[PDB]
Amino acid sequence: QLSRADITTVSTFIDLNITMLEDHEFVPLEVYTRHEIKDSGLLDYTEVQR
Amino acid sequence: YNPSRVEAFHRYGTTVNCIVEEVDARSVYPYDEFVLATGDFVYMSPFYGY
Ligand SMILES: *[C@@H]1O[C@H](CO)[C@@H](O)[C@H](O)[C@H]1NC(C)=O
């Protein structure tokens, strides 16, 4: 009696590798926050009047 | 300061109050002038010098 792995084996199937799409996490990103846009002005009427 | 009370007469009273303050100056490109926290414009480059 001999084991099943003692004889050479050939794959009769046509392998098809399937790599699922990895999960992705999106982080917040802004070129200029609303605070930066407000600060872009040279003068602010609110602060000047205050 | 105001003048003392003298009947049916106009009087002029001068008041001089020296004031010194620390203000945050701001400037934008080409940086040829800058403003102050009080809203006053200064037509001189912040980097002007000899
Ligand atoms: C992936 O597919 C290939 C054939 O494209 C196959 O040879 C391989 O054994 C498969 N599995 C792994 C883990 O690479």
Q: How many residues does chain B have?
A: 50
Cβ-contact B3, B11 below 8 angstroms: yes
3-state secondary structure chain A: CCCHHHCCCCCCCCCCCCCCCCCCCCCCCCCCCHHHHHHCCCCCHHHHHC
Instruction: Give the neighbor-by-neighbor strand order of the sheet with B26-27.
Output: B26-27, B34-35, B41-42
CA gap A35, A8 in Å, rounded: 71
Resolved by? cryo-EM
- Do residues B11 and B1 make contact, with C-beta atoms less than 8 angstroms apart? no
Q: Residue B35: CB partners within 8 Å, gap ≥ 6?
A: A42, A43, B25, B26, B27, B41, B42
Instruction: Give the Cα separation of A5 and B47 in Å (integer).
Output: 84
Name chain B contacts of A43, Cβ cutoff 8 Å.
Answer: 26, 35, 39
Ligand 1 neighbour A17 (Cβ under 6 A): yes
Residue A1 identity: Q
Mutation probe of ligand 1 site: the residue of A14, A17, A20 with most atoms within 8 A of C-beta: A17
Kindly provide the resolution of this structure in angstroms, with one decimal.
3.1
Question: Are B45 and B31 spatial neighbours (Cβ–Cβ below 8 Å)?
Answer: yes
Q: List all residues of chain A from 15 to 44 with a beta carbon under 8 Å from chain B.
A: 42-43
